[PDB]
Symmetry: C3
Subunit: 320 residues, 3 copies
Amino acid sequence: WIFHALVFSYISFALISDKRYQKKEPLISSVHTKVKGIAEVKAEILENGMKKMVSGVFDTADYTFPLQGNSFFVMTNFIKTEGQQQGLCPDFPTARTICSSDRGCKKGRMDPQSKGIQTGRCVVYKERLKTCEVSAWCPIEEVKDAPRPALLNSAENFTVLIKNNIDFPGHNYTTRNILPGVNITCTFHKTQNPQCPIFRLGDIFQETGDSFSDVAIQGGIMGIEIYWDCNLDGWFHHCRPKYSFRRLDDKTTSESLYPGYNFRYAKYYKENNVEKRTLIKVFGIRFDILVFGTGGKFNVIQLAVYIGSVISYFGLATVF
Amino acid sequence: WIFHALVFSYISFALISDKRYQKKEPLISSVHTKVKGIAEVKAEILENGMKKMVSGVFDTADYTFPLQGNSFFVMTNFIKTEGQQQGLCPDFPTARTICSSDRGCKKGRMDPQSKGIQTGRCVVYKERLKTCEVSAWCPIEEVKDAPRPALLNSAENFTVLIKNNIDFPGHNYTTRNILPGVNITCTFHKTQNPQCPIFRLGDIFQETGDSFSDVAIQGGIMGIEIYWDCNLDGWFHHCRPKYSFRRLDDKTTSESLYPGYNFRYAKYYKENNVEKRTLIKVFGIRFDILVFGTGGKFNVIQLAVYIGSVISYFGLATVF
Amino acid sequence: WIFHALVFSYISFALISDKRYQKKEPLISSVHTKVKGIAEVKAEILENGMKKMVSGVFDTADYTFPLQGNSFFVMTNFIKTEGQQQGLCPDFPTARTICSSDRGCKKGRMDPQSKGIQTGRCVVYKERLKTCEVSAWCPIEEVKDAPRPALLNSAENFTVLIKNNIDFPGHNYTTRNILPGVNITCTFHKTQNPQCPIFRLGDIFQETGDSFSDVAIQGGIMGIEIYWDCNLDGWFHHCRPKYSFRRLDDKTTSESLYPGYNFRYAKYYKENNVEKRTLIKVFGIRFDILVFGTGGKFNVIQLAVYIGSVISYFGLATVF
Ligand SMILES: C=CC[C@@H]1c2ccc(OC)c(OC)c2CN2CCc3cc4c(cc3[C@H]12)OCO4
Ligand SMILES: C=CC[C@@H]1c2ccc(OC)c(OC)c2CN2CCc3cc4c(cc3[C@H]12)OCO4
Ligand SMILES: C=CC[C@@H]1c2ccc(OC)c(OC)c2CN2CCc3cc4c(cc3[C@H]12)OCO4
Ligand SMILES: *[C@@H]1O[C@H](CO)[C@@H](O)[C@H](O)[C@H]1NC(C)=O
Ligand SMILES: *[C@@H]1O[C@H](CO)[C@@H](O)[C@H](O)[C@H]1NC(C)=O
Ligand SMILES: *[C@@H]1O[C@H](CO)[C@@H](O)[C@H](O)[C@H]1NC(C)=O
């Protein structure tokens, strides 16, 4: 008859383990993000084989755009080009783009890595180098890598503040991430201060374990997962988040798969009543706020059906 | 034997009410938003202690950007600054920025509220006021509040149209918000017209109960929740949405937590072959369309398992 | 006694097919999209009744913006206007905008289709036509349709690459779309190459079944659904996606419902120290990546409860 008891204990254990007496529903989320911290740039780069110095200050209206769909981007490196205008000009001489005669390359060709429409006419590029030029924005951008020192090497010193508002539509519950009367100043830590949401990017990378400068050179994507494990029962009610970080990139390191994160952006203006654009190749770190969770409440129907299921189980256990 | 009959009524009630004979699956959504209504601005503001008049017209391409990830933003108030250019200039004199001696403040300091890198050199700012200047965009913006009258005071007269398309991947079902042959002209009302989705922002606030001007001055976030309670059974088939609204903000009213919604935006240009930006501090209302819902079809497996698990409930009650 | 066996066969069939021994949990996703392929524009349009020629090249930084919240936009057609500036100017002559006397139209009117604030003063517009002018951007844009040939007629020749990274929070599992050591060069096909994610816009339209030119003229929204049916049990483990394509639009073709996809964009500049904006009316194809899927692992509790539920189901059928 002791066996008749043991299953009962197991049953209770199972219930207490997973709250089968709790109708559970998914989560609806709203995220608001504020990034603060100014950056100083001062370094020496090279363009067209000529050295130049770049200096300036970025004031959080310059190196990012407002949050849109749970993803706020943070600039870390750039390659500049100015004076682009519509015309014909020789393309950056590569193996596929080199020629000695106009008949070498065909007009209208669209090489995947070429940024201009080819007219099939080989012309001298520079110092007796011959390539068949393209009709595009000119002068053509030189395809190189981002400068080895981080142009915004002070990126990890920034601070991001996150306000998360969760609501469950089944139950009548909506609550925020920050409760009234909380510590304003913070620096998020796993154990020292695990609740206030002020994140330092250096802290994020230290938790992840990667080198911030290396992935900042080529850009990358990561995510700040927010876990809401809330119980709505009055007897034991607690609804508090847990923060985790994870690198969302793959570290492919293959040229064909576009390693890291980067894009191209254009600024237009009028010079001498002529349209002229300047091109910025931006490498950055893209943060995602992946908030997920479940919320449940005591419900009679789930308890009844689970008891009905367990009844036959222990009846059979007694039978055999 | 009546006790053997009350369980039948209870089980039928539960099965009919919660629809246990249905395979409930989540929802996949697509949202498309169009905002229409022009606005006129005409007011008197003050900059550097001098009064100026601002007037103009915004044409639904000037005060918003296209929908991106279920969130379309609407401008409400702005603070302007022009002639920004790289240099060194005294910071806006506050308690943490004032100084009387050169050694008063240290070079390289980055105050959280200061927008420039501090070089630690106390210089006269204006009428014998001394602060240690910063090397940044100049002249420095004056941190003030948004003007008490709403610069976009005619914001609540706008009209927003929402087209929602839901698909369930389990079942072969996809349907839209607007059925063919429906009233074009509308103004959404709780009871007068509860289905056509033309929303007025003033009505949006009126349903919530908050004053439009107060939230508009400092900005805020609210949600337009769309609830799809659809049943796919042929006998009782109805799939129509219900519209609800809520304020997603917190009303913190604390300076340290950045009350309301605002951001900073820049427009670059060339003046005398010199880079010059102009800065806009934007306060606005960011709308979110938080769509959720469930749907299910009749399934033999769910009905069979529920019947098998509910049989023991009366099988035992007969014994006792 | 065979009836005792048919129920066992049915139970085993249901358990194997629908996987009752699994703890099914939702999916968390991250998407990274790269669009490549240059476009050339060369055509003849008409503005103000005068013919003009438009030519140029778009280089994947001109006709799109970076991915933001699972939606990347692609240019396909545009209408240009330049020289806009704040002032008073006659509105485009329509039925609601025409007048013969000043008292005919009342000041302050806001017609839904009018883009300017009306001052109620009938003035000559062009060759003895009379309309009451509006205080707005000038000269007023002429409301027309997009040019019948596709300005971005080569749009279907572009290539889009998609990197999807999924994680399940319940189990300790995260995986990406592309496995190491895969074919780089690709063109997606239903049967020839169904796994590598390089998509051609012409290919996806062909799979959908609609012509590219007609949809591109007025714009539309379609989704790239990615389905992850992953099983985490070690015995039979396979986590590979299935690609499906669908058109998210409605084909309303009604003027009041804004058929197709389009918006208005502005570029600002300074000419003769006067602010002057230029307006672009954009018709484009907005792509969505609607990712969804489920995954689960072997769990003792689900197996136990399902057996306890089916025990009564077979026991009662044994009785009768
Ligand atoms: C890419 C983000 C910032 C971008 C950038 C990059 C390099 C620069 O120096 C070379 C810039 O000038 C100083 C800027 C200016 N901003 C303004 C904010 C901004 C916002 C954007 C964007 C680009 C920019 C560039 O794409 C969509 O949303
Ligand atoms: C912030 C939204 C509108 C912005 C703005 C603010 C103040 C102004 O008075 C000087 C503006 O001129 C009339 C404009 C013009 N637009 C164009 C649309 C637009 C779109 C944006 C944006 C800013 C703007 C500014 O940030 C990302 O997406
Ligand atoms: C609307 C997308 C592209 C837009 C456009 C339209 C017409 C043009 O001439 C015909 C343009 O010049 C070549 C451009 C340039 N870009 C840069 C990228 C871009 C990005 C955007 C945007 C507009 C543009 C315009 O709205 C928010 O995000
Ligand atoms: C970050 O800030 C700390 C102190 O504020 C400073 O010591 C450190 O050098 C900074 N790092 C960078 C990369 O600017
Ligand atoms: C909104 O519009 C109504 C009528 O169109 C007008 O009476 C009212 O004054 C307007 N409100 C604002 C703030 O412009
Ligand atoms: C697309 O490309 C193919 C081959 O690259 C070419 O034959 C075809 O004409 C192109 N279509 C357009 C519209 O440019």
